[PDB]
């Protein structure tokens, strides 16, 4: 019944990429009709869930701030669900929550090398989706904890499946892109091939398409392992080569994911999410 001229209109912003050849919408601050959609979506009784992993330090360094910026901007006026791994459940900060949301905490099991823990979400996610996730929410988003929201991150960005376009490289050409190049690689990509470079910290769409899209990736991790070789960005690579098979039919712009290190440029208008300046030092630790 929701078509797309519906809610999104191209043409309010002209100088950037707002459709893709296989016709997914890029969704920029001015394209979107949030109040036609929280309408339309509101008549579904539709419910919202985010997971986030906090392993380590990452839990006091940045845990808090995401929570507490997803209950301010995250699908305001929805009911969501927040899906919280951690490694040590004691040190789990239990923030209040606002109308329409509520959570739930998970103990899970710290893997010894950052590079695992970043890639095992997948095999995890996945395994929660079969368990509970799918009987309880309409769309699901995963994301990175090293950030934060700044503004309205809302039904504007759900969708089958959705993917964030990397802040350093979505005006670049495909053959800048930061592919795993290697042919040994599950995820290789080779140079010639690609639509665009999208970012592993917000990924989502219905429980079904996140599902095949962690347990896809999981799988060329697996494969990677069996081979004995690791993707130059680990998830990263793997969700790239998974979206350049499975195109997204969204993608969000860098508004929706912002590196603020890079200054302001005219295309980002309105920042929903910001990246956490890094702290490998302390909350890594290896290589
Ligand atoms: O020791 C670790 C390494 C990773 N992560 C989780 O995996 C995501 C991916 O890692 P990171 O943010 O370090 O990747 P980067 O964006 O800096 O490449 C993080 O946001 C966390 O949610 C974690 O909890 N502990
Ligand atoms: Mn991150």
Known sequence: ????????????????????????????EGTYNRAVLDNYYAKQKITVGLTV???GRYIEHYLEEFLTSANKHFMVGHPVIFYIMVDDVSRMPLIELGPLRSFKVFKIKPEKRWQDISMMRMKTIG????????????????????????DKFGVETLGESVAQLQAWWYKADPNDFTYERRKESAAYIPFGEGDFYYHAAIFGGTPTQVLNITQECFKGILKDKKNDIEAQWHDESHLNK??????????????????????????????????????????????
């Open 1 to 28: 019944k929701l078509k797309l001229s519906d809610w999104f209109n191209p043409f309010k912003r002209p100088e950037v990429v707002t459709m893709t050849k296989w016709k997914a919408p890029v969704v920029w």
């Open 53 to 55: 992993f906090a392993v």
């Open 127 to 150: 395994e929660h989706i079969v368990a509970h996730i799918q009987h309880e929410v309409d769309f699901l988003f995963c994301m990175d904890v090293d950030q934060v929201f700044q």
């Open 242 to 287: 998974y979206f350049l098979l499975n195109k997204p039919t969204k993608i969000l712009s860098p508004e929706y994911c912002w590196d603020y290190h890079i200054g302001l440029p005219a295309d980002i208008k309105l920042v929903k999410m910001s990246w956490q300046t890094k702290e490998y030092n302390v909350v890594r630790n290896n290589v």
